[PDB]
RNA sequence: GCAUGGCAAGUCUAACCGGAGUAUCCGGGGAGGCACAGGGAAACCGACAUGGCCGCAGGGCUUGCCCGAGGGCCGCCGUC
RNA sequence: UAUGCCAGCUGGUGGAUUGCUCGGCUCAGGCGCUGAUGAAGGACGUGCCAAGCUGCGAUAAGCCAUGGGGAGCCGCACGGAGGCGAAGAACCAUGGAUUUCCGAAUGAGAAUCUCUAACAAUUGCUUCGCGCAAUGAGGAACCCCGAGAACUGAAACAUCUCAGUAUCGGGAGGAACAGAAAACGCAAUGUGAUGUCGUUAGUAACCGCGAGUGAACGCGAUACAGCCCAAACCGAAGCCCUCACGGGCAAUGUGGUGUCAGGGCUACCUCUCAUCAGCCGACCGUCUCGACGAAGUCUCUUGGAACAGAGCGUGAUACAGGGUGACAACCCCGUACUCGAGACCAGUACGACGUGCGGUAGUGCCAGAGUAGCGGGGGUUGGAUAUCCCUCGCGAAUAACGCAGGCAUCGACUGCGAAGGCUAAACACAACCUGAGACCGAUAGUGAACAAGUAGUGUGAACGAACGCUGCAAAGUACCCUCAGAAGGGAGGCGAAAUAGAGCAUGAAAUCAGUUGGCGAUCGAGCGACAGGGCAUACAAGGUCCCUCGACGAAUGAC
C-alpha cells in the first residue's frame, strides 16, 4: 500500500510505498509470547539467605518431658519450618533460572507481526490510543530527527491530530500495593512510539507516555507494550524503509 | 488449573496412605538399587560384552544414498552437466571430518549420472550404470585391494 | 538513586553543609528577576510570606533557621501554650516565599549577584 | 484450547463451509485440526506425487514439506507449506491455502485427502 | 510423556563479538548437539522416492459401483 | 427470682489486621592488602551536667594547613546553663599534629600492671657494634602447599561411595597458581607457551564390571608475549657499602659471551630495528564525587492542612525518585543537557636511547645424574599393561646421544631436548564503594529496623532473646477542687481528632466488668441440621406475607 508523508508543519508532502511487512498477519499470541520473554529476561535473581534459621545448635529433647520433639535452644524452639525464627521450608532460590528462551525465528515473526498491527487504525484504536486520524502509522519527513525542543514536537502532533494520546498518558496512577515501598509507586498509559533512524528522538522522549526507538533495533515491546498489539506509532521517512527488512 | 494447584486440603497429595512417601524405602533403595534383586524387571542384564578398538584406529565414512543425489540433480546446477557429472565429495555435508566419502544405493536413479567418490556399494553401481551412468573411483578410492 | 529508602535516607543523614539546601525558599517575582534565580537559602534576616498552612497569607521576618530540623521561625507565626506563653510554630521553607533579602553579608550578596552560582 | 488465532478462524470457516455447502471434507479436516498438533499431517512432496491426480485438489489436513519430487500438475491445499514446498509445488502446479480452497470450492468436491 | 507454538530434511545456537534505549533489547556467532541408515563384538558390508490384497475417513458416479491418503495383512530389500 | 446458659451493646484486656519503613535478603558493576615507622583487636580514659552509642587519646565528641562551604553552630539526643562564629565557625575533601596501657608485642616479668637500658627470638650483611636490614601478627572469602574423617549410598557390607568433601597444619597476593614443549599424535605437506569459558561427553577409561566414578586431544571463544641462566670460548675486564677516604665480596669465578630461529671456536658474507636494559609517558574508557540546571505556588469550592474537584496557565535534551499538613514535571531537593575533579586502566600503549638480527663452511669444543630407566611396597587417578606421587633397592648415554607417539622388545617413521629459572593479559572472591530488585515488610526479612552479638545462660569452649508508629505544629495540659500526695480522680485548656495524652495510627479473637434480648432453681448430655411455634427488632442495605372465593389442576383419589 501507500503511506502519506508529512512535513514538520503537518502538511502532506508526497507519499511512499508502505513496506510489505506491514501486511504480515497480526498474531497476538506470538506477540504476547515475545513480550512475556523480554519481561522475564530483565528480572533479577533473588532468594533468602541459605543459612537463615540454621545458625543454632538447637536440639530436640525427644520423649520424656511431655513435649513435642522440636529442636530447642535456651528453651526456645528453632530451626524447623513450623518454628517461629525457624528456616523457610521452600523459599525463593538464587539458583533458579528465571529467563525464558525464544527461537530467533519465532521472535522475529512476532516483531514483524507487531509492526503490521501498527498499520491498522481499528486495532490501534482498540488498543486504547486516542487520535483523530484515518491513516496509520503516521509517517513523517526525516527532518523530524533535527528537532530539538519538545514543544515543537507538540505542535506537529497537534497538527497531525495525534496529540490526544499524549493527553491520555498525561495521568499517572498511584498503584495499589507495596510496590510503592520499593520505588514502583507510579505507572502510566503508553502513548506514541517515535521510530527514527539515526538516534532516538531526544525532542519527543519526554512526552507523557512516549517511547522512542530506532528502526534498526525497535522491538516487540515498544511496538506492542504489555503484549497488546497496535500501538499508535510515528515513523520517520527513512525509519519506515529501514524497518522493512527486519 | 493444574494438578499441583488442586492438592491443598487433600492431606496426602496423591500419595495414598500418609505412611507411603517417606525415605528411599518407598523407592526400594536409592538410584539403581536392586537392579538384580527386587527390581530386576526390564533392566539390562548384568555382564560384559565385546571390546572396543582405539578411537584413532577407527575410520568414519561419510555416506550418501543415490536417492539424495538424484532427487536434487537440477537443483545442483552448480555442478557439471555432460552428455550429469557430480563429485559427491562436493555434495556431502560433514565430508571434511570424515576419512572418506561413500555412495550407497538406496532409492532410484532416474537420470544418467557420472559419480565421483572414494567408494561405492555394489547396489550403488548396479543402479547408476543401470540408468546409463558411470562411476568414477577417486584416487583415495584407490585403496581397494 | 531511584529507591525511596535511599532518597529519604540521604536527606535525613545529610551533613550540615548539605542541609542549607533543605532550607531554601522560592523568591518573589521581583527578586527572581533581580538576581536571576528562582529561589534562595532563607536567612535569619530575610522577610517572607507564608503561602500554605494555617498561617497562609502572613508575612514576617525570619527570626531563626534550624538546619538540624530543617525548619524556620517567622515573627508572629506562633502557637499559644497552655500557660498562655506564645511560641513559634516551625515552618517548612517549601511553604514560604522570600519577599525581601538581608544582604548585610558581602559574601551572600556577592553570591546572589554572581551569575555562575546561586545563593 | 488452540492458541493461534488464525488456526481458530480457519477451523471456524471450515465448519461454516461444511454446514452450509455440500462439503463433508471441510468439516472432516476441521475435526482433524481440532485434534492435537502431534496428530496433524506432515507430508512431503513424494507422497503427493504418488497418490495425487490432476484436476483433483489435494487436501492436506496439516502441513506440506519439501522432501522428494513432484511432477504432476496438481493444486495442493494445506494449512501451511514450508518455503521450499510451496516453491517446488508452484513450479509444476499450484500451492493454495485451505482458506482459498474453501472459497473456491465450498462444496468441497473433486478433492483427495492426503496425510 | 503430554498440550500449545516456530521452523522443517532439517533444526537450535553455546561461550563469546558488535550495536544500543547498556543486566532488557537489535544484529552476529552453527563450535557443537540431535535428526537425516542400518546391521555387526569387530573386521566389514550397507536398505521399499512402492510390487500385491483388504479397507476406515473422504472423493467420484448414472446410488449399488469406482478412486481409496492414514491404517491392516503380505511380499521384497540392508546386515549378523 | 439466685448460682447460671446463648447472643449482642458500652468499657477494658490483648496486639491480630490494614496502612507505613531508618532494617534485611539477593543480584550487578567498581575496588582491594595491613603490621616493629608497633597493625587488626582489646582495656582504661576523654564532655559544663554524661549512663549507653558514636568519636577521640592526657592536645582525648577534638588541634593545624590548603581548597570547598556558609550564617549559623556546640554528634546520636526535641534539656538547662553557658559558650563559639564576619579574626568567616559549623560542615566536607586532601594533607599534617597529637595518638595512654595491653596487644605479633620484642629488656625481664604480669589476668591490661610492675621491675632494672633493651630489634626478645631466628637470620642476612657486617664498619663484627643490633651498626644496617629481614621475619613474626591481621584480613570476608578467594588462592597455593601439606594432614585428612565419618555419618551416607550400595536398600546388609568389606573394594567402591559419601570425598580429597568437613575439619586441622603451613604460606602468598590483590588476585593466586600455571606458562614458552624431552608437547600434541583430528598420523599430518598438520597444530604450536599457560589459565579460563562453551563444547568435545556422561563419550574413552574405571568398577563386588554392582551401586556408582569419569577425563583428554581437538574445535569455537577470551586474552595474547615472550625471554633469562649453567657450560663451551674469554679470566678480574666485576659487584656491594660510603659524600669521600676507605672497607667488604670475588680464581671454590665477579664480569663478558651464550641459551634449539642450538651455542662456542677458526674462516668469511651481510647486516642490525629481533631481543634485552633503562628513559618518557598518555588519549579513550569505566567507577565514584562535585558544579550548573527550565516551568504556577493563580481563581472558586471542600478541608485542620490543597498535593483534591472544577476553571485558567507553563516548562520539557528535565513526565526517574524523594520531600513538603492529602493524588505535585512547574512549592523544595533533584532529574535531562553541559562541565569539573579523583581513582582504576597504567608507569601500560606509543615515542625515543643504547644493544645488535641473520647467513655459509669447517670443528665428535659445550649443553643440568642417584637423574632417564628397572624392580619390591604403598597411596592416588578415568588412566585401563597405557595416571600422578611417596618410599626401599638398583641404575645410563653424551647430540655420532637421548626422550615421546596409551602393553614389552628391535628396526623404520614423525615429534621433541628432561634432570636450572623468570614471565604481562584473559579467570576466583567480596571485605570496601555505588547501583539495582515480579524478593521480605516488624512472630516476616539477618540472631540483630530498637540497648544486638545488647540483656541474659554456662567454669569454659560456647550459647543468646524481646522491644518500630502522639500530633500539621508540643500547641507535651495553665488555673481551680479533692487527696498524705510531682500519685490518682474531678472540672478545665489545646487540637480536625485526646476513644491522638506517652510501647500515645488502626485496635480482631480468646477473654473480663457492667448491661440488653431470649431461657432459667421438676429436670438430661456431640451442643446441631431440617420443619414448625413463643418472645425480641429505629433507619439503611431485603419486601414480602396471611385469609374468603375463583382459575388451573400431575400422580393419586373418595364420602
Ligand atoms: Cl570399536
Ligand atoms: Cl511424508
Ligand atoms: Cl592439532
Ligand atoms: Mg526466619
Ligand atoms: Mg493489600
Ligand atoms: Mg545569581
Ligand atoms: Mg613488653
Ligand atoms: Mg548401606
Ligand atoms: Mg586456577
Ligand atoms: Mg549389591
Ligand atoms: Mg571420583
Ligand atoms: Mg590427549
Ligand atoms: Mg579413594
Ligand atoms: Mg525478627
Ligand atoms: Mg493505640
Ligand atoms: Na546463633
Ligand atoms: Na539464576
Ligand atoms: Na504422605
Ligand atoms: Na553445525
Ligand atoms: Na575495594
Ligand atoms: Na554519655
Ligand atoms: Na589517631
Ligand atoms: Na626488627
Ligand atoms: Na649486631
Ligand atoms: Na541401606
Ligand atoms: Na547396618
Ligand atoms: Na570397585
Ligand atoms: Na576440525
Ligand atoms: Na510545600
Ligand atoms: Na593420582
Ligand atoms: Na617404586
Ligand atoms: Na609426542
Ligand atoms: Na516486632
Ligand atoms: Na424463631
Ligand atoms: Sr522411652
Ligand atoms: Sr499419585
Ligand atoms: Sr528425614
Ligand atoms: Sr526403584
Ligand atoms: Sr538375581
Ligand atoms: Sr561441523
Ligand atoms: Sr544534628
Ligand atoms: Sr538531631
Ligand atoms: Sr538460528
Ligand atoms: Sr501401506
Ligand atoms: Sr599466542
Ligand atoms: Sr639441556
Ligand atoms: Sr606399539
Ligand atoms: Sr512481637
Ligand atoms: Sr543475615
Ligand atoms: Sr556444663
Ligand atoms: Sr477533661
Ligand atoms: Sr382433573
UniProtKB/Swiss-Prot annotation, chain A:
It comes from the Archaea. Keywords: Ribonucleoprotein, Ribosomal protein, RNA-binding, rRNA-binding. GO terms for molecular function: rRNA binding; structural constituent of ribosome. Residues 92-103 have a biased composition (Basic and acidic residues). GO terms for biological process: translation. Pfam families: Ribosomal_L4. The keyword Transmembrane helix does not apply. InterPro entries: Ribosomal_uL4, Ribosomal_uL4_dom_sf, Ribosomal_uL4_euk/arc_CS, Ribosomal_uL4_euk/arch, Ribosomall_uL4-arc. Residues 37-103 are annotated as: Disordered. GO terms for cellular component: ribonucleoprotein complex; ribosome. Part of the 50S ribosomal subunit. Interacts weakly with proteins L18e, L24 and L37e. Has been cross-linked to L18e. PANTHER family: 60S RIBOSOMAL PROTEIN L4. Belongs to the universal ribosomal protein uL4 family. One of the primary rRNA binding proteins, this protein initially binds near the 5'-end of the 23S rRNA. It is important during the early stages of 50S assembly. This is Large ribosomal subunit protein uL4. It comes from Haloarcula marismortui (strain ATCC 43049 / DSM 3752 / JCM 8966 / VKM B-1809) (Halobacterium marismortui).
Curated annotation (Swiss-Prot), chain B:
Residues 29-46 have a biased composition (Basic and acidic residues). InterPro entries: Rbsml_uL15_N, Ribosomal_uL15, Ribosomal_uL15/eL18, Ribosomal_uL15/eL18_sf, Ribosomal_uL15_CS. It comes from the Archaea. The keyword Ion transport does not apply. GO terms for biological process: translation. Residues 1-58 are annotated as: Disordered. Pfam families: Ribosomal_L27A. This is Large ribosomal subunit protein uL15. It comes from Haloarcula marismortui (strain ATCC 43049 / DSM 3752 / JCM 8966 / VKM B-1809). The gene is rpl15.
Curated annotation (Swiss-Prot), chain C:
SUPFAM superfamilies: Translation proteins SH3-like domain. Keywords: Ribonucleoprotein, Ribosomal protein, RNA-binding, rRNA-binding. Residues 9-23 have a biased composition (Basic residues). This is Large ribosomal subunit protein uL24. SMART domains: KOW (SM00739). InterPro entries: KOW, Rib_uL2_dom2, Ribosomal_uL24_CS, Ribosomal_uL24_euk/arc, Ribosomal_uL24_KOW, Translation_prot_SH3-like_sf. One of its GO terms (cellular component) is large ribosomal subunit. The keyword Ribonucleoprotein applies. The keyword Manganese does not apply. It comes from the Archaea. One of two assembly initiator proteins, it binds directly to the 5'-end of the 23S rRNA, where it nucleates assembly of the 50S subunit. It comes from Haloarcula marismortui (strain ATCC 43049 / DSM 3752 / JCM 8966 / VKM B-1809) (Halobacterium marismortui). Residues 1-25 are annotated as: Disordered. One of its GO terms (biological process) is translation. One of its GO terms (molecular function) is rRNA binding. Belongs to the universal ribosomal protein uL24 family. NCBIfam families: rplX_A_E. Part of the 50S ribosomal subunit. Interacts weakly with protein L4.
Curated annotation (Swiss-Prot), chain D:
InterPro entries: Ribosomal_eL18, Ribosomal_eL18/eL18-A/B/_CS, Ribosomal_eL18_arc, Ribosomal_uL15/eL18, Ribosomal_uL15/eL18_sf, Ribosomal_uL15_CS. One of its GO terms (molecular function) is structural constituent of ribosome. Keywords: Ribonucleoprotein, Ribosomal protein, RNA-binding, rRNA-binding. Pfam families: Ribosomal_L27A. One of its GO terms (biological process) is translation. GO terms for cellular component: cytosolic large ribosomal subunit. It comes from the Archaea. Part of the 50S ribosomal subunit. Interacts weakly with proteins L4 and L15. Has been cross-linked to L4. Stabilizes the tertiary rRNA structure within the 23S rRNA domain (domain II) to which it binds. Belongs to the eukaryotic ribosomal protein eL18 family. This is Large ribosomal subunit protein eL18.
Amino acid at each position: 500500500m501507500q503511506a502519506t508523508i508529512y512535513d514538520l508543519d503537518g502538511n502532506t508532502d508526497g507519499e511512499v510505498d508502505l513496506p510489505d511487512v506491514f501486511e504480515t498477519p497480526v498474531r497476538s499470541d506470538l506477540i504476547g509470547k515475545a513480550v512475556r520473554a523480554a519481561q522475564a529476561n530483565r528480572k533479577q535473581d533473588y532468594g533468602s539467605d541459605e543459612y537463615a534459621g540454621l545458625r543454632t545448635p538447637a536440639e530436640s529433647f525427644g520423649s520424656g518431658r511431655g513435649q513435642a520433639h522440636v529442636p530447642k535452644l535456651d528453651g526456645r524452639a528453632r530451626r524447623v519450618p513450623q518454628a517461629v525464627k525457624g528456616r523457610s521450608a521452600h523459599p525463593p532460590k538464587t539458583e533458579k533460572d528465571r529467563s525464558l528462551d525464544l527461537n530467533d525465528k519465532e521472535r522475529q515473526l512476532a516483531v514483524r507481526s507487531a509492526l503490521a498491527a501498527t498499520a491498522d487504525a481499528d486495532l490501534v484504536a482498540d488498543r486504547g490510543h486516542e487520535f483523530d486520524r484515518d491513516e496509520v502509522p503516521v509517517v513523517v519527513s526525516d527532518d523530524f530527527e533535527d528537532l530539538v525542543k519538545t514543544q515543537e514536537v507538540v505542535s506537529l502532533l497537534e497538527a497531525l491530530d495525534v496529540h490526544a494520546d499524549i493527553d491520555r498518558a498525561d495521568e499517572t496512577k498511584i498503584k495499589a500495593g507495596q510496590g510503592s515501598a520499593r520505588g514502583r509507586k507510579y505507572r502510566r498509559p503508553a502513548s506514541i512510539l517515535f521510530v527514527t533512524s539515526d538516534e532516538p528522538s531526544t525532542a519527543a522522549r519526554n512526552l507523557a507516555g512516549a517511547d522512542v526507538a530506532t528502526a534498526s533495533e525497535v522491538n516487540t515491546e515498544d511496538l506492542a507494550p504489555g503484549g497488546a498489539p497496535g500501538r499508535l506509532t510515528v515513523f520517520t521517512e527513512s525509519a519506515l524503509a529501514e524497518v522493512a527488512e527486519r | 488449573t493444574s494438578k499441583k494447584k488442586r492438592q491443598r486440603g487433600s492431606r496426602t497429595h496423591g500419595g495414598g496412605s500418609h505412611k507411603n512417601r517417606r525415605g528411599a524405602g518407598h523407592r526400594g533403595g536409592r538410584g539403581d538399587a536392586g537392579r538384580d534383586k527386587h527390581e530386576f524387571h526390564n533392566h539390562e542384564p548384568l555382564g560384559k560384552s565385546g571390546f572396543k578398538r582405539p578411537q584413532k584406529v577407527q575410520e568414519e565414512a561419510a555416506t550418501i544414498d543415490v536417492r539424495e543425489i538424484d532427487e536434487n540433480v537440477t537443483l545442483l546446477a552448480a555442478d557439471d552437466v555432460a552428455e550429469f557429472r557430480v563429485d559427491v565429495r562436493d555434495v556431502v555435508e560433514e565430508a571434511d571430518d570424515a576419512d572418506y566419502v561413500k555412495v550407497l544405493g538406496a532409492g532410484q536413479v532416474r537420470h544418467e549420472l557420472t559419480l565421483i567418490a572414494d567408494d561405492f556399494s555394489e547396489g550403488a553401481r548396479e543402479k547408476v550404470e543401470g540408468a546409463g551412468g558411470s562411476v568414477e573411483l577417486t584416487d583415495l578410492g584407490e585403496e581397494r585391494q | 538513586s531511584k529507591q525511596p529508602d535511599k532518597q529519604r535516607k540521604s536527606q535525613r543523614r545529610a551533613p550540615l553543609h548539605e542541609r542549607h539546601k533543605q532550607v531554601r525558599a522560592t523568591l518573589s517575582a521581583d527578586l527572581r528577576e533581580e538576581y536571576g534565580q528562582r529561589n534562595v537559602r532563607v536567612n535569619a534576616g530575610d522577610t517572607v510570606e507564608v503561602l500554605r498552612g494555617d498561617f497562609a497569607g502572613e508575612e514576617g521576618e525570619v527570626i531563626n533557621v534550624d538546619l538540624d530540623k530543617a525548619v524556620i521561625h517567622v515573627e508572629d507565626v506562633t502557637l499559644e501554650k497552655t500557660d498562655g506563653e506564645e511560641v513559634p510554630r516551625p515552618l517548612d521553607t517549601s511553604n514560604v516565599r522570600v519577599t525581601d533579602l538581608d544582604l548585610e553579608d558581602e559574601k551572600r550578596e556577592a553570591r546572589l549577584e554572581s551569575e555562575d552560582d546561586s545563593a | 484450547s488452540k492458541t493461534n488465532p488464525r488456526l481458530s478462524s480457519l477451523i471456524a470457516d471450515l465448519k461454516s463451509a461444511a454446514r452450509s455447502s455440500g462439503g463433508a471434507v471441510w468439516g472432516d479436516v476441521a475435526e482433524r485440526l481440532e485434534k492435537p498438533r502431534r496428530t496433524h499431517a506432515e507430508v512431503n512432496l513424494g507422497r503427493i506425487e504418488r497418490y495425487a491426480q490432476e484436476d483433483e485438489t489435494v487436501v492436506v489436513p496439516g502441513k506440506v514439506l519439501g522432501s522428494g519430487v513432484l511432477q504432476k500438475d496438481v493444486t495442493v491445499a494445506a494449512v501451511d507449506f514450508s518455503g521450499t514446498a510451496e516453491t517446488k509445488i508452484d513450479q509444476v502446479g499450484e500451492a493454495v491455502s485451505l482458506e482459498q480452497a474453501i472459497e473456491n470450492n465450498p462444496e468441497g468436491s473433486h478433492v483427495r485427502v492426503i496425510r
